[PDB]
Amino acid sequence: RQLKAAYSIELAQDLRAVHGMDADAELSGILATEIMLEINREVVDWINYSAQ
Amino acid sequence: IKKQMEAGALVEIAEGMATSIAELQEGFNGSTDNPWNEMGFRIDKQVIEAKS
Numbered sequence: 001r002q003l004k005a006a007y008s009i010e011l012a013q014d015l016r017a018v019h020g021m022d023a024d025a026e027l028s029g030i031l032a033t034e035i036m037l038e039i040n041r042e043v044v045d046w047i048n049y050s051a052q
Numbered sequence: 053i054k055k056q057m058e059a060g061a062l063v064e065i066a067e068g069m070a071t072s073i074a075e076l077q078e079g080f081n082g083s084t085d086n087p088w089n090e091m092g093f094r095i096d097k098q099v100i101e102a103k104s
């Protein structure tokens with residue numbers, strides 16, 4: 001599995017200046033959590049896919 | 053041209069790029085035909101013989 005995301009430099013400056021969010025950890029936090037969510041859902045999905 | 057400049061018809065001007073273009077420069081987000089502006093340098097020599 002794989003994902004990716006890109007952000008402009010000006011947006012990173014703009015987001016930090018007006019909101020205090022670094023615009024880089026958020027995308028890292030979003031992508032890392034999303035992959036774990038899909039995998040966690042998948043394993044449960046296979047269990048029901050295989051249950052007698 | 054200088055005579056026009058004195059008369060006030062034409063005046064010097066200096067602006068800056070709107071941030072929208074400053075992100076979409078030669079690439080990012082699918083934009084095309086917008087290369088950067090670059091600078092370089094050249095080195096040239098001179099040679100001096102000796103008289104007597």
